[PDB]
Amino acid sequence: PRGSPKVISVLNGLLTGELTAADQYFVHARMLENWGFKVLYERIEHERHDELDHAGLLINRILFLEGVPDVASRAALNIGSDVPKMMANDLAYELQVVDELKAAIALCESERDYDTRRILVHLLEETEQDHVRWLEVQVGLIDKLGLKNYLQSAAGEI
Amino acid sequence: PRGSPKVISVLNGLLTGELTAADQYFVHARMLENWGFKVLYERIEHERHDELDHAGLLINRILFLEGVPDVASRAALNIGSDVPKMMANDLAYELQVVDELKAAIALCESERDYDTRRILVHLLEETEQDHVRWLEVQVGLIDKLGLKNYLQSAAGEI
Amino acid sequence: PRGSPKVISVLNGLLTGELTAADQYFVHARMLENWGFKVLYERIEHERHDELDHAGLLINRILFLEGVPDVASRAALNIGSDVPKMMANDLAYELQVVDELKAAIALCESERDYDTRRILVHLLEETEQDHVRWLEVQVGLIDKLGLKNYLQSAAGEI
Amino acid sequence: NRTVLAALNDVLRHQLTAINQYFLHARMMKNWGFNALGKHEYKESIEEMKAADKLIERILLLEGLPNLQDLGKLLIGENVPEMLKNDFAMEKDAHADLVKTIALCEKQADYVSRDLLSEFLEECEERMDFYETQLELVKKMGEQNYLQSAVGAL
Amino acid sequence: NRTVLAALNDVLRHQLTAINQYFLHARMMKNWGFNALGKHEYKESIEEMKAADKLIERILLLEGLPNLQDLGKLLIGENVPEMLKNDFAMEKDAHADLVKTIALCEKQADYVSRDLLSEFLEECEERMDFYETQLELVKKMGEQNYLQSAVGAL
Amino acid sequence: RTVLAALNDVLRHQLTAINQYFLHARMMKNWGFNALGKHEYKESIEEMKAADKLIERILLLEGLPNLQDLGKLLIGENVPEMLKNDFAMEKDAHADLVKTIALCEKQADYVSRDLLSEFLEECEERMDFYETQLELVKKMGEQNYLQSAVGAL
Amino acid sequence: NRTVLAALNDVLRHQLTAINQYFLHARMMKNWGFNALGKHEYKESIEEMKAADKLIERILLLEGLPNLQDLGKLLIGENVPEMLKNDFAMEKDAHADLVKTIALCEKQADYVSRDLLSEFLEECEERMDFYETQLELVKKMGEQNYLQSAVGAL
Ligand code: HEM
Ligand code: HEM
Ligand SMILES: [Fe+3]
Ligand SMILES: [Fe+3]
Ligand SMILES: [Fe+3]
Ligand SMILES: [Fe+3]
Ligand SMILES: [Fe+3]
Ligand SMILES: [Fe+3]
């Protein structure tokens, strides 16, 4: 069924954010694997897979709404030179995604697109309870355990 | 969990008694195995393991109450020359241990240290229903069956 | 088969050493469990049971040689205030028993007691390649990992 | 008995306070990512809930009215060492009351209540042992090492 | 914001009061031999604890401090129909407060909180329907037949 | 010897409880109350096991168990009467057991004391069960209680 | 019939006395360490209680009042040969009573209880044979050998 132009635009913005997040998490996971932080690499790989799943859901919604997805568009990438900076950059990007998701949910509610609102609410739940929560936990553990102990935990068994 | 000095002292005394019981049971089981009484050897190996477990419980309690578990101290041993003397010595020693345990239970109830009282009641129950009872049964069986029949039963399969 | 007074005497000395080691290992394992060092506690408990088996082997050999085991006598115990002193004392006692076992093996060879020599060589092999080796490894790990990291590994999963 | 029922009500008030404090501490531990310590605190919370269940059934046995309204002061810490010390503190201050209650139950010839409270005392003393051990482990291995062990699997 | 945290803490206090009320009612129901009704009430109490668990998670995630100290007034019933009426009434009041909280969360663009509270509302209205129909069952089949059903297998 | 006499009195009551519970269970099964009869059969069996434990304890004390004596059996003519008779016998059990436990604590004898304490735990559980059964009879009506006690037809 | 019910009550009293005697003898056999003889005495006790269950059900089905109050004189042996002799003598009395009761039940044309008592008499005669054989084995093989056999596994 035909969708609103505003709904399509906010969905395309969310898709651009999700694709950029997936690419950033991909590079971060690979640089963590390169550095030997196996458990961090596994977690960030799973998070990247979740990001691809969310992007797929967004593209399905966009096509269902008879819109054209903007997959060529990519946002700026903030790549960290070490694990604390990587965690901070991922957390900041996920926070911006959270704000954009909340704005899009409000727009969908105003535009009477309740199915899109349900999809975006599920995405916001995933971003807040799985992604943002884990990253904030990681920064807290970096500050509590210390960088050396946190990196020892991140490396895992060798 | 600092306990009363009297409770710690009597627990150390019980520990000394229990370790001496373990040593006596060890020697008696070894000489019963040497003589070919494998059934009695198995029973007394079980009993010596039980006494080691009791000594472990006592040491754990003394360490919980911020006390120093004395283990270097031993009481005089009573090694039996033959199986009836083994039974008599083990029975007499276990009865004396029962008397000490009852005194310790009364004192522990007096000092309102009820967890130690529960541990000591468990130890007294094990000493009375399992160790003292079996030794009384063995003495009565040596009396009724006669020495030769009892030793034949103790030998088992030759 | 008659056993010479010298062979039985050195076997009794070795048995006294094994029993004293069993008591020291008992106390050390119990205080390790008290402090929450679970991994070290399980290891030391297994080593103490190994010492009990060694003492049983010695008692059986002494009783074969028609000699009365010396189970009551105990050497002076050396209980460590903390883990590094604990394991330094354990290593020192193990080295002492290693020298005693070597002297006993030489005497057994000099006296044509080849089966006793075999049992003592098995005891020395176990002592050197299991007890002494692990203790020297533990001291090296205390030096290398540091006390805090070594205690973290000793505590295991809390 | 009136005195025994009042003492059991006070013990139950302790039990409910301990349940709430344990569960809150476990929840903030999970929030901070201390998965192992959070799991253990959740288990101790659940055990306290089972003990309070036993106590409420015992009070209803004695034809009394269990008091699930009163709650003691909740000692909530800002960091893991403060949680451990607060938990051990409440366990000790209530262990003394449990001992006094067991003495009272022995006085009044109430022996099933005495048996239940003795079991509660054994579990409580194991808990104090665990928490004193945790504080000494923090002292020994260090704050950062203990926090790393509390996190467990990243 | 502080308003959303205050609303969530109010809902959490409602949850804790419901937990205590359900557990007390189940305890007295099995004290009186109402095994089936007591089992259902104990299960509902467990579900309320799971809900309070989720609420504490959400409050901690929102950089807040859950209030596990404050508790509401417990409507302890003198018999089974009074327990049903008390539980139904407190569920009605909690449902009204929950609806207000959901509206406030939607107003503040707090959508994950709205999802959690919508789940809470679904479960709460399921309970409310259950207690309403149990009171109507007491009416329809009589008090003695309802008590016979509430006891279940002897 | 006082501990032995007290244990013998507890054993006499336990034998009487065995007999009363078994006879009540058999009467309930004769009337068709299968659920109540099964529960009373289980209670009699538990009291048989309790008497077994107490006879073991008395013999361990080098005493002579007095299995000859038996207390009066309170036999009921209808189900509520047998319920209250069981309850009264259990109340007497509880009083005697508490006196016995205090005596055992006084005589520095602790193993028979923990045996009597667990016995008192089951006895208080049974007391609660029978008081609850009587209150349930009152609550649902005798007809409904008998219907439940029948179980499956 | 009244006489049949009185005879059934007498046989029930005999069976209850036998139950008590057999269980006591089993318990002191286990106290002395005669595990195998104690196990056989325990099994014999259990069979006598199953027989008393059958007899009680028969008395009730005849619309009669079972007399579980009465009990005969317990013959308690100081040693195992005396235990076996006492068990055999009590079985002698029980068998004579059973034969008379079976004759009476046949006379009154009450055949179901007669068949139940025939089963009881078969078991009683088997018990006669077992105890007579045990005493004869004692005499043949010596008290010490018989006691060693009664111990079985040490
Ligand atoms: C006040 C806040 C409470 C919270 C947040 C809470 C939380 C929980 C949770 C999450 C569970 C596990 C449920 C599951 O695994 O499905 C549980 C179980 C249980 N709770 Fe609560 N609880 C609370 C209070 C209480 C109280 C006051 C009592 C009793 C007086 C109680 C008694 C129980 C019992 C008996 C269980 C079953 C545990 C088992 O059998 O394994 N709870 N609780
Ligand atoms: C007077 C002292 C008695 C004692 C010490 C005693 C002891 C026992 C014991 C230990 C059991 C074993 C239960 C199990 O292991 O599952 C048992 C079962 C049983 N008892 Fe008793 N009992 C006594 C009297 C009676 C009486 C008087 C009757 C009936 C009139 C009776 C009927 C039964 C029955 C039917 C069983 C079940 C048998 C089976 O499950 O195989 N008992 N008793
Ligand atoms: Fe996402
Ligand atoms: Fe580390
Ligand atoms: Fe012992
Ligand atoms: Fe060694
Ligand atoms: Fe009905
Ligand atoms: Fe023979």
Q: Could you tell me the two tokens for B29? A: 């089981």
What burial class does residue A114 get, using C-beta atoms within 10 Å of its C-beta: 0-12 exposed, 13-18 middle, 19+ buried? exposed
DSSP for residue F77:
S
Q: Which residue type sits at D20?
A: N
Q: Which residue type sits at C53?
A: D
Distance CA D45, CA F112 (A): 35
Distance CA D151, CA A141 (A): 8
Distance CA C135, CA C147 (A): 15
3-state secondary structure of B69: coil
CB B55 within 8 A of CB C26: yes
Q: Could you tell me the two tokens for A72? A: 């060529």
Q: Could you tell me the two tokens for A133? A: 């929560």
First to last CA, chain A: 54
Distance CA D55, CA D16 (A): 11
* Residue of chain A whose Cα is closest to the Cα of D142: A145
Q: Which helix (H) or strand (E) holds A83?
A: helix A83-110
CB A77 within 8 A of CB A20: yes
Q: Could you tell me the two tokens for D40? A: 């253990």
Q: Is B76 in the C-facing interface, judged by CB distances under 8 Å?
A: yes
Distance CA E38, CA E22 (A): 9
CB E87 within 8 A of CB E22: yes
Q: How many of the other CB atoms lie within 10 Å of CB of D90?
A: 21
DSSP for residue D79:
S
CB G96 within 8 A of CB G150: no
3-state secondary structure of G61: helix
Could you give the count of Cα atoms lying within 13 Å of B84 in the half-sphere of its Cβ?
11
Distance CA E100, CA E36 (A): 34
CB G4 within 8 A of CB G122: no
With b meaning 16 or more CB within 10 Å and e meaning fewer, what string describes G54-83? Answer: bbbebbbebebebbbbebbebbbbeebbeb
Q: Quick one: how far is CA C108 from the chain centroid?
A: 20
Q: Quick one: how far is CA G13 from the chain centroid?
A: 11
Q: Quick one: how far is CA B155 from the chain centroid?
A: 23
With b meaning 16 or more CB within 10 Å and e meaning fewer, what string describes F39-74? Answer: bbbebbebbbebbeebbbbbbbbebebbbbebbebb
Identify the CA nearest to E15 among candidates E39, E40, E50. Answer: E50
B111 Cβ contact list (under 8 Å, min separation 6): B4, B6, B7
Cβ–Cβ below 8 Å for D136 and C157: no
Identify the CA nearest to E117 among candidates E131, E97, E92. Answer: E97
Ligand 2 in reach of F18 Cβ (< 6 A): yes
Q: Which residue in this structure is represented by tokens 């009136």?
A: D2
Q: Checking phi first, is residue A78 left (phi over 0); if not, alpha (psi -120 to 50) or beta?
A: beta
Distance CA B140, CA B152 (A): 16
What burial class does residue A130 get, using C-beta atoms within 10 Å of its C-beta: 0-12 exposed, 13-18 middle, 19+ buried? middle
Is E106 annotated for ligand binding?
A: no
Distance CA E128, CA C140 (A): 67
Could you give the count of Cα atoms lying within 13 Å of G118 in the half-sphere of its Cβ?
9
Long-range contacts of G89-96 (CB under 8 A, 24+ apart): G90/G17, G90/G18, G90/G21, G91/G18, G91/G124, G91/G127, G91/G128, G91/G131, G92/G128, G93/G14, G94/G11, G94/G14, G94/G15, G94/G18, G94/G124, G95/G121, G95/G124, G95/G125, G95/G128
- Chain F residues whose CB is inside 8 A of the D111 CB are 98, 101, 117, 120
E4 Cβ contact list (under 8 Å, min separation 6): E62, E104, E105, E108, E110, E113
Q: Could you tell me the two tokens for C125? A: 């092999």
Phi and psi at residue E152, in whole multiples of 5°?
Answer: 75, -145
3-state secondary structure of D65: coil
Ligand 1 in reach of D29 Cβ (< 6 A): no
Q: Which residue in this structure is represented by tokens 């009794």?
A: C12
B38 Cβ contact list (under 8 Å, min separation 6): B155, B156, B157
Identify the CA nearest to C117 among candidates C21, C4, C20, C19. Answer: C4
Q: Which residue type sits at A141?
A: L
DSSP string, A9-56: HHHHHHHHHHHHHHHHHHHHHHHHHHTT-HHHHHHHHHHHHHHHHHHH
E105 Cβ contact list (under 8 Å, min separation 6): E4, E7, E111, E113, E114, E117
Distance CA G94, CA C22 (A): 63
| Minimal Cβ distance to E111: which of A105, A129, A133 | A105
Dihedral sign, CA of E30, E36, E37, E39?
Answer: positive
E17 Cβ contact list (under 8 Å, min separation 6): E71, E72, E73, E74, E90
CB E23 within 8 A of CB E42: yes
**Distance from the CA of A130 to the center of ligand 1, in angstroms?**
25
Q: Which of D20, D46, D67, D71 to mutate to test the pocket of ligand 1 (most atoms within 8 A of CB)?
A: D46
CB G33 within 8 A of CB B140: yes
First to last CA, chain D: 53
- Chain F residues whose CB is inside 8 A of the B121 CB are 110-111, 114
Shortest alpha-carbon distance between residue E61 and chain D (Å): 7
Dihedral sign, CA of A20, A25, A26, A31?
Answer: positive
3-state secondary structure of B7: helix
Residues 100-139 on B with a CB inside 8 Å of C are none
Across chain G, the runs of DSSP E, i.e. the strands, are none
DSSP for residue E69:
S
A40 Cβ contact list (under 8 Å, min separation 6): A29, A32, A83, A154, D154
DSSP string, D91-113: HHHHHHHHHHHHHHHHHTT-HHH
* Residue of chain E whose Cα is closest to the Cα of F138: E144
Distance CA G74, CA G83 (A): 11
CB B154 within 8 A of CB B39: yes
- Chain D residues whose CB is inside 8 A of the E73 CB are 69
Question: Atom of ligand 2 at shortest distance to CA of F51?
Answer: 5
Identify the CA nearest to B21 among candidates B52, B43, B46. Answer: B52
Chain E interface, mutation test: which of A128, A132, A137, most E Cβ atoms within 10 Å? A128
Distance CA A65, CA A5 (A): 10
Q: How many of the other CB atoms lie within 10 Å of CB of F131?
A: 19
CB F58 within 8 A of CB F115: no
Q: Residues, chain C, total?
A: 158
With b meaning 16 or more CB within 10 Å and e meaning fewer, what string describes G111-139? Answer: eebbebbeebbebbeebbebbeebbeebe
DSSP for residue E62:
T
CB C30 within 8 A of CB B11: no
Could you give the count of Cα atoms lying within 13 Å of F131 in the half-sphere of its Cβ?
16
Q: Which residue type sits at E76?
A: I
Experimental method: cryo-EM
Overall resolution, Å:
2.9
Distance CA E134, CA E127 (A): 10
CB D62 within 8 A of CB F127: no
Distance CA C74, CA C18 (A): 9
Distance CA C157, CA D149 (A): 7
Distance CA A75, CA E151 (A): 65
* Secondary-structure breakdown of chain C: helix, strand, coil percentages, each rounded to the nearest 5: 80, 0, 20
What burial class does residue E54 get, using C-beta atoms within 10 Å of its C-beta: 0-12 exposed, 13-18 middle, 19+ buried? middle
Dihedral angle of Cα D107, D113, D115, D117, to the nearest 10 degrees: -90
Identify the CA nearest to D44 among candidates D109, D145, D124. Answer: D124
Ligand 2 in reach of G59 Cβ (< 6 A): no
Distance CA A19, CA A28 (A): 14
| Ion ligand 4: residue ranges with CB closer than 5 A | A 149; C 149; D 145
Among protein residues, the one with the nearest Cα to ligand 1's atom 6 is E49
Q: Quick one: how far is CA E56 from the chain centroid?
A: 16
Q: Could you tell me the two tokens for D104? A: 């009272």
Cβ–Cβ below 8 Å for B39 and G154: yes
Identify the CA nearest to E7 among candidates E127, E108, E119, E90. Answer: E108
Long-range contacts of B72-75 (CB under 8 A, 24+ apart): B72/C23, B72/C74, B72/C76, B72/C77, B73/B16, B74/B16, B74/B19, B74/B20, B74/B23, B74/C72, B74/C74, B75/B16, B75/B17, B75/B20
| Ion ligand 3: residue ranges with CB closer than 5 A | A 54, 127
- Chain C residues whose CB is inside 8 A of the B74 CB are 72, 74
Dihedral sign, CA of E78, E80, E83, E89?
Answer: negative
